[PDB]
Paper text:
To target disease-causing proteins that are inaccessible to small-molecule or antibody therapies, we are exploring the use of a nature-inspired drug modality that exploits the intrinsically favorable properties of synthetically constrained α-helical polypeptides (Helicons). Here, we report a rapid, high-throughput screening platform utilizing phage display that enables an unbiased mapping of the α-helical interactome of a given protein without any prior knowledge of its structure or known binding partners. Analysis of 14 high-resolution crystal structures of Helicon–protein complexes across six different protein domains reveals a range of binding modes, all of which are “side-on”, i.e., mediated exclusively by Helicon side-chains rather than involving main chain amide interactions. Biochemical and structural experiments demonstrate diverse functional impacts by the Helicons which bind these sites, including inhibition of protein–protein interactions, inhibition of enzymatic activity, induced conformational rearrangement, and induced dimerization.
To assess the ability of Helicons to bind and modulate the function of enzymes, we screened the cyclin-dependent kinase CDK2, involved in the regulation of the cell cycle, and also the peptidyl-prolyl cis-trans isomerase [name] ([name]), which binds non-α-helical peptide substrates and catalyzes the cis-trans isomerization of proline residues. Peptidyl-prolyl cis-trans isomerases (PPIases) are a family of enzymes that recognize a diverse range of proline-containing polypeptide substrates, and are targets of the “trimerizer” natural products CsA and Sanglifehrin A that bind [name] to form ternary complexes with the proteins Calcineurin and IMPDH2, respectively. A Helicon screen for [name] binders afforded a pair of shifted clusters that competed with CsA both in the phage screen and in in vitro biochemical assays. Cocrystal structures of Helicons from both Clusters C53 and C54 confirmed that they bound the site ordinarily occupied by peptide substrates or natural products, providing a second instance where the screening platform was able to identify an α-helical binding solution to a site ordinarily recognized by peptides in a non-α-helical conformation. A PPIase assay showed that these Helicons inhibit [name] activity, as expected given their orthosteric binding mode, demonstrating the ability of Helicons to directly block enzymatic function.
Residue numbers in the entry:
A (entry chain D): 1 to 17
B (entry chain A): 0 to 165
Write the structure that this text describes.
Amino acid sequence: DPANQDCHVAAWHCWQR
Amino acid sequence: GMVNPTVFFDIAVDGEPLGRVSFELFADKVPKTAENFRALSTGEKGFGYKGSCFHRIIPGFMCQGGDFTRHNGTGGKSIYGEKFEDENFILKHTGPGILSMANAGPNTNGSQFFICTAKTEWLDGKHVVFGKVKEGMNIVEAMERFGSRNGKTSKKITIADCGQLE
Ligand SMILES: *CC(=O)Nc1ccc(NC(=O)C*)cc1
Ligand SMILES: [N]
């Protein structure tokens, strides 16, 4: 099944806070 | 111990050769994760990274690839017949060149991975580090010229060839 394998990008955005 | 594998990618930009990146895979620490990436790099299971692209490149952060099944960032598969567990978090995101697994949450490893272009300590404990660039970090930096803040790439950045060095 397809999966959005982007959790590290969300973590980067959180660190950019 | 057994020698850790070294694999290579030959990178192309819209078909034009850019250069070769090699990686040490830390099979001594993460054997199952290293073996997945090693086998996908040789193509020996009948599928793998050759011909696939780096679909998300964020300059100053990382270059991500591994979707050889759908070629759009949602695909990729492991050699195990299903997504696999986070093997361990022994190794850390210590600086540029680290090779780490992309995932959709805990225990969802398939074939997607990223090469860090900076220290990314905020990923420690959530992404399994399993290798590091040996030669060709300048090629990875050159790849960043085709990235963007949202990560969409401006040209097709492809793994034109790949394999395991002897
Ligand atoms: C998929 C996933 O785990 N995403 C995610 C979102 C946010 C964060 N971090 C913060 O919000 C600080 C990590 C992972
Ligand atoms: N931040």
